[PDB]
RNA sequence: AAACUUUCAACAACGGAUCUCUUGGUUCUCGCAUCGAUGAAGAACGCAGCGAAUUGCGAUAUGUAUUGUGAAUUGCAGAUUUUCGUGAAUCAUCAAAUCUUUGAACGCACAUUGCGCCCUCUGGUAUUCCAGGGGGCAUGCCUGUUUGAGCGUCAUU
């Protein structure tokens, strides 16, 4: 007894212990290898003659 | 008389009838029961040495694995010797995988390849910033879970 004197007439939802995930098995099972590798990002270089201008003269492959 | 018009012939056009064909349909019978949040159906964009479509598949992209078959594929090119072999093939089979972006579509959005937050790791002086790799975060309901709320309500110091 001697109850909780409150000030806010507004009764908000009382902050509580939001527990985190501790799942009994991995959903994915095997972590997937990198979607987008080094080699998989950059495919072919270019041979359009006006790129080979830009390579040699501008220093941009 | 010629030209012309007409009729009719052979040959030639035009045109695609007829005939004959037929990997399509068609109805009838029989057998079976098997989609999907373990992401279905559908879509989008891709992917072939040379593909536009089709067919197949998903950045492991006309496939990988497995098994069988036992030498193809074939338009060209090309391999490779694997041809008394754990092994050819646009083969069959198919139980292992991959399965972009989507889509019931599920972080929140969605005429946008937009905008977040969390966990973890690696870069950059980094718990907080950025970036990269991974794994997440939908709603309802259910069973439990812990955390709580109500002088709803009981019993105690």
| Nearest DNA or RNA nucleotide to A4 (CA to C1') | B151
H/E element holding A38? helix A38-41
Q: Quick one: residue A10, left, alpha or beta (phi over 0 = left, psi -120 to 50 = alpha)?
A: beta
Q: What resolution in Å is listed for this PDB structure?
A: 3.6
What end-to-end distance do the CA atoms of chain A give, in Å? 79
Inter-residue contact A27 to A21 (CB < 8 Å): no
Is the CB of A58 less than 7 A from some atom of nucleic acid strand B? no
**Cα A22-A24-A26 angle, rounded to 5 deg:** 90
| Nearest DNA or RNA nucleotide to A31 (CA to C1') | B134
H/E element holding A57? helix A49-58
**How were these coordinates obtained?**
cryo-EM
- Å separating the CA of residue A41 from the C1' of nucleotide B27: 57
């Amino acid at each position: 007894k001697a109850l909780k004197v409150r000030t806010s007439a507004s009764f908000r939802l009382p902050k509580t212990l939001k527990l985190a995930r501790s799942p009994k098995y991995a959903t994915k099972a095997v972590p997937h290898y990198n979607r987008l590798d080094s080699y998989k990002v950059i495919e072919q270089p270019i041979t359009s003659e006006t790129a080979m201008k830009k390579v040699e003269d501008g220093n941009t492959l």
